[PDB]
Amino acid sequence: SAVSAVFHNLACRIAPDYALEATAKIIATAKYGKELLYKQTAISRAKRAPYPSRMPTGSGNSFPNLNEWHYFP
Amino acid sequence: AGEHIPIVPVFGEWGFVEDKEVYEGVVRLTKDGQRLRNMIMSFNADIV
């Protein structure tokens, strides 16, 4: 996904020499390549943290030693 | 001295299930909803 990102992005970086810019195609492809680069990372880093101490496991399940979820029952 | 066991146990609601002796009090599975009420009560503490 970063193959089609890098050389369009670098084209915008070397474009300033008297504060010049790159054209609309160059900024578009680099932006969409940057977006698909983080596509795999975003889903992986998205995690809902384990249930709080307040949350119970209820009496709908067996009692192992202790009850009311606290990363044990 | 006893010719029968002198300890006669009582129970609550009594019977067998799988051929496992199962006794209980009234509020056995009341304790599912008891802990759920405790969760909501303490969760709203942080909000206030």
Report the alpha-carbon distance of residue A68 to residue B42 in Å, rounded.
13
Structure obtained using: cryo-EM
Q: What angle do CA A55, A59, A60 make, to 5 degrees?
A: 100
DSSP-derived secondary structure letter, B15: E
Nearest-Cα distance to chain A for B41, in Å, is: 9
Residue with tokens 């006893």: B2
Residue with tokens 């304790």: B31
Sequence letter at residue B7: I
Q: Please give the resolution of this entry in Å, rounded to 1 decimal.
A: 10.5
Sequence letter at residue B6: P
A2 touches chain B (CB under 8 A): no
A4 touches chain B (CB under 8 A): no
- Residue B35 is encoded by which pair of tokens? 């802990």
Q: How far is CA A71 from CA A33, A52, A68, B39, in A?
A: 40, 9, 9, 15
Which ranges of A1-68 would DSSP assign to H, the alpha helix?
3-13, 24-37, 39-45
- Return the half-sphere exposure (C-beta side, CA atoms, 13 A cut-off) of residue A32: 7
Contacts of A5 (CB under 8 A, 6+ apart): A29, A30, A33, A34, A36, A37
Report the alpha-carbon distance of residue B43 to residue B30 in Å, rounded.
20
Report the alpha-carbon distance of residue A15 to residue B15 in Å, rounded.
85
Contact A73, A63 (CB under 8 A): yes
Nearest-Cα distance to chain B for A50, in Å, is: 15
